[PDB]
Each structure stands twice: as structure tokens, then as C-alpha cells.
Design a protein around this nucleic acid. Structure first.
Lengths: 147, 211, 52, 204, 95
RNA sequence: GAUGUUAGGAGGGCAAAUCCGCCGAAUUUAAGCAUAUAAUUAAGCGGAAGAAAAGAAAAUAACUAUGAUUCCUUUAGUAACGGCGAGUGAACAAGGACCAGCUCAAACGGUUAAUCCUUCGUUUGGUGCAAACCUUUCGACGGAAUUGUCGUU
RNA sequence: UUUUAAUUUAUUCAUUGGAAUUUUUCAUGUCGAGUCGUGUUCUUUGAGAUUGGAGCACUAAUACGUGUGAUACAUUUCACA
RNA sequence: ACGGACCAAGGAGUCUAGCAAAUGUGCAAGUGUAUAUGAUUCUUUAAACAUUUUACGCAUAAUUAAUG
């Protein structure tokens, strides 16, 4: 790795690629994020627009487990289950799959995508989106709330 | 700073060279721990070094569904299994005095686990062919022939492991048994809307019951 | 000054390691490669050589 | 049952009886030397409730300790430094006066003994009084006893200087648990060390 | 949120008593010592002040007694408890 | 109380990488500087062990709940702190290593301190060539202790 | 050489005490005070109408109590210790 | 204008953390098996090998101070 370094290819070039005029000094602009709002303000405003200031109210101790919930959209519910069983449920109209997405690791079912027409499916989840439920019972299925 | 980079964040403004450490001995320590537990199982000679732990449900709604090994069976679980905590702690059964059985499901699952362990136990005499029938729920002492014929059989260490749950994320129902009237999103929204006054009613119920 | 917290080791993808082992076995199976690596195998009957 | 009545009486400290007794004994302590041996506990119930026992190797010492803050140790007020560190008068010691008192006797006055605990005894404008229980780890009455003889082996010498008595536990933040202590449990310095010990795996 | 100790949980994840649907399962010596110690010690001076404020027996004086006890003891809870104990003792001594 | 060159004992000093208390900066960064940072750091004082310290909930959570301490992976550069600037910055859950629980106080025992120590003895068997060491229970003597030892839980 | 597992053998005669659980009774006992807590001051903390500590002033209840539940209050439920 | 009397030997963009871009490689709605465990491997080996059909990171969904 050290023999591929760019400094090696400037070995006899005096300035080491850092300029004969400006030189390579130590912290000529300041240390870290020093000059924001003063002499690095163009950089801060051009690349990190909303950096300065505060917005919103404080949440004192969070406990992310309380509001943790992974989501899944309806268009992946059928792909959750294996191909052969998908074919079985498609060919047979009197049976429907009952999928407990909470077991796969999803807490909320979201409504993005398209479910197969006239293919009933019962979905068990802790939370449901309004459009997710609308699509599920539009294809003849049902949403079951679990906890 | 310059160009379009993330704003730097490095917390190396103290004397960090003193606090950096590298684990050159990760696998050496692996071998040492393996050797230590091998030697302490040869030392007790047949009786496993593992102790039985209960199956408990992980707290919080994140890990609600998952179970794991707790520490210690409860007093109720031990009494359902028929043995006292002091006796149980001499046969490799952990006991903890803090946990309580809030649900019959946990109570019975851990009692069944304890009974399976007890039925799997074969007890060595304290006095070398002076077998007795035990106390505190400890099973009766096995005799020379069964001890000799079981000492060469592989001990089942699967009992000490967290149980494997059957994984039915999939199942089928008849299409005619689908409730086409249920409104899950409306139910969720209504429950959240009504939560406040129902807590009120519960508080008033508690106040009334306190008298 | 050389420090002991140099990156001495490298974490290698398990799939890439398994690929490398499989490819090494495959390469050992072909005669021209075993000849080109430096072994004097002009006189053995077949290169995926197996004995009882 | 007498200890219950003694405890309940001492729970008042503002009654006429307790006020009078505290006045007279504090007056006597003021005339006595700064560290002096007491024949028997002056508060037998409180001593017994702390670790004290009537075994031969248990002794008790009474200690005065000055009140207030100790002032910053600079020569005159001059502190050469930033204004954040220029204060000299409102400097509060980390250790409490009880711990200071037991140090005053356990350091060298009787360095052959082991400090067990200490208790209240009296207050004053300029002094606080305490009685410290000490154990002789070299007495056979202590050594042979299956209880109490934990204090005989080392790792127990100068607890009053390692902050291991009850007063030390109090001022080290070890009298609270959970989110109110959080960062003190294995010791403050050890917890701080662990919280920035940067660990690098060999293979990363 | 609040739960119910009876009437098993609703199987949904939000609202009142939500969650899984598991099966739930459910003086002589003291005041002798109090009497003798009271006989020996009496009342502390601030307790005497509270006693006299209670004995004055107007709403202004009871308010003042609660404020005084609260200042003397710290905390509204301790001040209030002291006031009720002293009112009980004043009634008892009135009998 | 005082006093004893009465009998038997202990402390002191060295050493410090890890460890436990205290005390405690400034350089530095902020492109200046004063809060802040450096840093609960260096220096200074004291105190231990082969580990120390912490430790058996006046703990979490809000769940279908967990269950002493420590450490690792993570939580997480997160919640939060901050001339809200520079900078700083945890906890709970989760996966592991290891895994261990206990006793005083207080309660109860007065047809009887049932406790403990000192000194002086007797034998009970053992491995040493010897030197020494491990076991040993029958006392007696002098004390301590009811201003409370021991047993019970 | 060290120790440390398994395998060798234990049998007779006796009283002395103790222990666990299970039946029948009585009482709900004990439970750490100049301490906790509060105010103020200084420090410390990520801890913010204050995280811990310390000094000073005031100074508790008695388990139906009192302490935690990360925003200061009052009245009060609940949980945990 | 400054440095250089001469010669030899030494002598300066590196190491770690973190982020990104570029490119190569593997796998792909996944990916990385973390700490740790096992296992007739225990000179090398402190590396290789392995992981009883919801650990965690990042990604797979955004947005709002926020109830959501």
C-alpha cells in the first residue's frame, strides 16, 4: 500500500505537491469546524444548509424500543411466502394464506404497490395503514390486529 | 473544512493514545476459556457444568414475541415442580427470588421444563452404594447398575438450551371464514382516541374499589 | 514511530474465501496449471490424482 | 427491647431531655482531646445497629472535626489561572466530615486497627463529633469468630482511606443505583476509563 | 397506559389495557413505645408552634400552620402529614 | 481515665503496570477570548491485591415483561448538554462471557450466657531421616460479656 | 513428582442431635435518624425550573410508610423497589 | 537578497479513527456471521475451518417540533 502512495511520485519535486507559494502550513484556516458563520460560511451554507440553530422540542430519555416498528408494503406480502405455496394459493380459490408479518419481523403493513386481483389474503399485524387495509380488503382479504 | 464532505465529528480531542487497545489474544483467550470449561467438566466428572435456566419472555414491545433463558426459576415454579429452592440449587437448577409468574402460561411452561429436567436426572449416591430417596424434591438416588449403565451414555445438553419455537408465520383459512366487515385501521384510530377517558374510568374504578 | 495499532489483519468476506478455496481446487484439477506452478508432474497419469 | 426505646428517644434530639443531654455531652467533648478512646459506646443501640459488637477486639474512639469548607489551598487569594478556577472560599470537599473524622483516627493514631463505621454523637458551632468503631484484626476473639473475621484479612486495611466505609460509599455515589447513579457503579474513574477505552480488533 | 387487572387484555396493540391475551393471575407494642417516648420527650418547638396555630382554630391559622410546617419540614407532603397528625393530637387532647 | 522497659501482639518503610480514595492545573481548541474545551487529565497526597473496585435492587420497564455485580458486541456519536458555537455525550432493552449467594441490626430463647478469649495440662491418630506439620477432645485457671456474646429466623 | 476424576467394600450393635416438606393451632411482628428529604451555596454530570457529591440551615414518616417512574406544581390512580 | 568550506552516514505527507468519491471483487432486497461458541487443528496454528430452519449495523420509505 505504501508503494502506491501519491507522495512517492513527488519524491524529488521540492514542494511535495503542496505549492511553492501557499506552502503546506498547519491549520491555516482553523481546526475542525472552526470558521462556520465567519470564514467557512460559504462552505457551510453551500453543502450543509440547515446546520446552525435548533428546531423542535426535546424528548428527554427516548427508549427507542417503545416506538420501534418496522414496516412492510402490501406488494411484498405474497413474496413473503414460498413459490410453490404461492402457486397453490393461486390455483385454489377456497383457501387463503394467513400471514403474520409480526413473526417475520414487521410491525406495520403499508399500502404501497399492487396486490393480485381476486386473490384473497389475510394479514395479521400490529399496525395497519389505511390504504394497506383498503387494498387488502379490495382483493377480498382481511386485516387482523394482533399484539 | 473544504468541499462537500460530512461535517467532521471525531472525538479524539483528549489523550487517546493511552486508551487505544488491540485484542491480539482474541482466539488465544477463546482457547483458554475452552480449556478451562473442559477441565472443570472433567473435574466434576459426568455431571454437566451447565445449570438449568427458565424460559422467559424478553421485555418491551420490541422483543415481545421472543423468549430466552432467564436467571432462576421462581418459587412458584419450583413448588409446582415439587422442590424447594435450597434443594433445587444443589442439583444444577437456578433459582431467583425476584421474578414472579404474572401469567399461567409462563408458570406452566417453566414447571413442565423443570419436570422434564427432574425426570431426566439420575442421582449419584452421597455415600457410595448407600442410596437414599432424597429430600426437598430431589429425586431418589439411583443404584449401582443404572448409574454404571448411564455413565457411558451421551448426556443430553439440549435440555439446557433455549427452546426452539415452531415458526408458523404461514397458515391457511377457508375463504368463507374471512371477516369482510372488520375495519382494522378504524379500530386502531378509535382505540387511540378513547385511551384517555378509559384511563379515567380505570382510575375511578380503582378509587371506588379502594373504599 | 511504528505503533501496535496498525491494521495488522484483514476481515475477508466468507463468500469470497469460499470462492477462493473452490477455485483453488478447480485449478489443482487441471494439468497445465499444476505444471505451470512448478511441480514436475510429467510422469503421473492424471492430475486430479486420487489414491486408495 | 430497651434499644427500641433508646432509638426512639434519640429520634427526637429537640426534646428537653435530648437537648439537655446533647448540650452537656457536647460540652464535655469540646474539652476532651481531638481523638480519644471511649471506654464503651455512648450510643450502644446505634453502634450495635452499625457493625459494633461486645467482643474483646472492638474499640471505640471519639473524634472532633471542624465544620465548614476548607478554602482553596493557594497562597493568599492568588490563583494563577482562568476565572473559572479563581474561587477560593466556596470550595466544598468531596469527602464528608464523617469520613474525615474516621480518617483522623484510622490513618496513624491506631493504624493497627480497622475502621468499621462511625456515628453521630453531637454537633456544635465549630465542631462535629463522631464515634468510630474499630476492630483489632490481630485479636483471637475476632479471628476465631466465623462472623466479623472478614475484617481480619487484608483488602480491608484503611477502608477509611480507600473510601470503603459507609461514609465513603455515600460520598462515592454508591448510595444510589440505576439512572440516578448510572456512571459511578464500578468506581467513577474506572467507569470513565471504560467509556473511552477505544477497542480495535486485529482484523477490524 | 393504564391496564385492567381483570377482564383480559384486548388483543390489539394500542389503547386501554392493550396487548397479548395471556391468562392473568392475582397493634400493641408500637403505640406502647409511642406513648412512653411521647411521655419522655413531648413535642419539638416547631411542633408546639403548629399546635398553637391549630388551637387558634381559624382557616387563616390552619393555612398558616400548613405553610409553617411545610417550611419547617420541606415538601408539601411532609408538611401536610405533620399538620394532620397535629390536628389529630389537638382533638385528642381536647377530649 | 492516667501510669508501667508488666505479658502477648500490631502499625511505620520500599515497590506501582493494572487497582482504590483525595487534591487538582495550564498549555491546547474555539482560527481572538472570558463560559466551554483541554480534563473530572498531568503534577501533588494517601491506601490495597494477585487482581482491586463493584455487587445481591429504596433496579429496570410499561412488555406476553425482565431480575446482584463485572466485562465484551451493540444500543450510539444516539437521547441529551453547549457563547446551541467549538465541542461534549450517557442509559434501558437485545446477543454473549461468567454465574452464587449470604449475615448483622431488629423479632424470639431467663427452671438460669445456652457465649468468647488467655494460660496451663492429658491423649486421637497420621505422613518427615530429621527439622517440623496436620488432626485431636477431656478439662482446669484467669478474665471478658447482661451498657448483650451465642442459638433461632 | 503434584492433584483429580472414575472404578475397589462395606457389615454389624447403640443413642444423641439436627434438617426439609407436609397436617392442627396462634399474630401480623421486625425492617438501620441529625438519617432521608427540602432550601441555599459550590462543584460535578448528557441530566436539562439541577445527575451525584459536599458545606450550611431546617429536619421527617413508620410499611396504608417512603423512594424511584429523566419538566417545576396541586389532588389522585397505577407499577416497581 | 538569504543558506551552502569539504566528504560520508542519517534526514521529512506517515499511522490510526471516521466520511465520501473512484475503481476492482463477492453476493444481491438483501448484505456483513459481531461478541461468542465447536472441533481427533493445537511447531507453523495469534491462522485456517464451522455456525440445530427473528442478535446487531447498514439497506429495504418518506415526512413532521410533535400526538403521528
Amino acid at each position: 500500500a505504501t508503494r502506491f502512495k501519491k507522495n512517492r511520485k513527488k519524491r524529488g519535486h521540492v514542494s511535495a505537491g503542496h505549492g511553492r507559494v501557499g506552502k503546506h502550513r498547519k491549520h491555516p484556516g482553523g481546526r475542525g469546524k472552526a470558521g462556520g458563520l465567519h470564514h467557512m460560511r460559504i462552505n457551510f451554507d453551500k453543502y450543509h444548509p440547515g446546520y446552525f440553530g435548533k428546531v423542535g422540542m426535546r424528548h428527554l430519555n427516548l427508549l427507542k424500543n417503545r416506538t420501534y416498528c418496522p414496516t412492510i408494503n402490501v406488494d411484498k406480502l405474497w413474496g413473503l411466502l414460498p413459490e410453490e405455496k404461492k402457486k397453490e394459493f393461486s390455483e385454489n380459490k377456497d383457501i387463503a394464506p394467513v400471514i403474520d408479518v409480526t413473526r417475520k419481523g414487521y410491525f406495520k403493513v403499508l399500502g404501497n404497490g399492487k396486490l393480485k386481483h381476486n386473490q384473497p389474503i389475510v394479514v395479521k399485524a400490529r399496525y395497519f395503514s389505511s390504504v394497506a387495509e383498503k387494498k387488502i380488503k379490495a382483493v377480498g382479504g382481511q386485516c387482523i390486529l394482533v399484539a | 473544512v473544504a468541499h462537500n464532505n460530512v461535517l467532521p465529528n471525531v472525538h479524539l480531542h483528549k489523550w487517546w493514545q493511552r486508551h487505544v487497545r488491540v485484542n491480539f489474544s482474541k482466539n488465544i483467550k477463546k482457547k483458554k476459556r475452552r480449556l478451562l470449561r473442559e477441565k472443570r467438566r472433567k473435574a466434576n466428572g459426568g455431571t454437566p457444568i451447565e445449570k438449568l435456566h427458565p424460559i422467559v419472555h424478553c421485555p418491551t414491545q420490541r422483543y415481545n414475541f421472543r423468549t430466552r433463558l432467564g436467571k432462576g426459576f421462581t418459587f412458584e415454579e419450583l413448588k409446582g415442580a415439587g422442590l424447594t429452592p435450597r434443594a433445587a440449587q444443589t442439583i444444577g437448577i437456578c433459582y431467583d427470588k425476584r421474578r414472579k409468574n404474572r401469567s399461567e402460561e409462563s408458570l406452566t411452561k417453566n414447571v413442565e421444563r423443570l419436570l422434564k429436567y427432574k425426570n431426566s436426572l439420575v442421582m449419584i449416591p452421597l455415600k457410595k452404594n448407600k442410596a437414599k430417596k432424597g429430600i426437598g424434591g430431589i429425586p431418589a438416588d439411583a443404584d449401582k447398575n443404572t448409574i454404571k449403565e448411564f455413565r457411558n451414555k451421551k448426556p443430553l445438553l439440549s435440555i439446557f438450551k433455549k427452546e426452539k419455537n415452531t415458526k408458523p408465520f404461514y397458515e391457511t383459512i377457508e375463504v368463507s371464514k374471512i371477516d369482510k366487515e372488520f375495519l382494522a385501521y378504524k379500530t386502531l384510530r378509535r382505540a387511540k382516541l378513547a385511551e384517555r377517558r378509559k384511563n379515567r374510568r380505570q382510575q375511578k374504578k380503582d378509587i371506588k374499589f379502594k373504599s | 514511530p511504528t505503533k501496535i495499532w496498525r491494521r495488522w489483519g484483514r476481515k475477508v468476506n466468507l463468500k469470497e474465501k469460499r470462492y477462493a478455496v473452490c477455485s483453488s481446487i478447480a485449478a489443482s484439477g487441471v494439468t497445465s496449471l499444476v505444471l505451470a506452478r512448478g511441480h514436475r508432474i510429467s510422469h503421473l497419469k492424471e492430475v486430479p490424482l486420487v489414491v486408495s | 427491647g430497651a434499644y427500641k426505646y433508646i432509638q426512639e428517644i434519640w429520634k427526637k434530639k429537640q426534646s428537653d431531655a435530648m437537648h439537655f443531654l446533647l448540650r452537656v455531652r457536647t460540652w464535655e467533648y469540646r474539652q476532651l482531646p481531638v481523638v480519644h478512646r471511649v471506654s464503651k459506646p455512648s450510643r450502644p443501640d446505634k453502634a450495635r445497629r452499625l457493625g459494633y459488637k461486645a467482643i474483646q477486639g472492638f474499640v471505640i474512639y471519639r473524634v472532633r472535626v471542624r465544620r465548614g469548607d476548607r478554602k482553596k489551598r493557594v497562597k493568599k487569594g492568588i490563583v494563577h489561572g482562568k476565572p473559572k478556577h479563581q474561587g477560593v472560599h466556596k470550595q466544598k470537599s468531596t469527602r464528608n466530615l464523617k469520613s474525615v473524622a474516621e480518617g483522623k483516627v484510622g490513618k496513624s493514631i491506631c493504624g493497627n486497627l480497622r475502621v468499621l463505621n462511625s456515628y453521630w454523637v453531637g454537633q456544635d458551632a465549630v465542631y462535629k463529633y463522631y464515634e468510630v468503631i474499630l476492630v483489632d484484626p490481630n485479636h483471637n476473639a475476632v479471628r476465631n469468630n466465623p462472623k466479623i473475621n472478614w475484617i481480619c484479612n487484608p483488602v480491608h486495611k484503611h477502608r477509611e482511606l480507600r473510601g470503603l466505609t459507609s461514609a465513603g460509599k455515600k460520598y462515592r455515589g454508591l448510595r444510589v443505583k440505576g439512572h440516578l447513579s448510572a456512571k459511578s457503579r464500578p468506581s467513577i474513574r474506572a467507569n470513565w476509563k471504560r467509556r473511552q477505552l477505544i477497542k480495535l480488533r486485529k482484523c477490524r | 397506559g393504564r391496564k385492567s387487572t381483570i377482564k383480559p387484555a384486548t388483543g390489539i396493540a394500542v389503547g386501554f389495557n392493550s396487548g397479548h391475551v395471556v391468562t392473568k393471575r392475582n397493634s400493641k407494642r408500637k403505640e406502647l413505645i409511642k406513648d412512653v417516648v411521647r411521655e419522655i420527650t413531648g413535642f419539638s418547638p416547631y411542633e408546639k408552634r403548629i399546635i398553637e396555630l391549630i388551637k387558634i382554630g381559624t382557616s387563616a391559622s390552619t393555612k398558616r400552620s400548613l405553610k409553617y410546617a411545610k417550611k419547617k419540614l420541606g415538601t408539601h407532603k411532609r408538611g401536610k402529614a405533620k399538620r394532620e397528625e397535629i390536628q389529630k393530637v389537638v382533638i385528642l387532647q381536647r377530649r
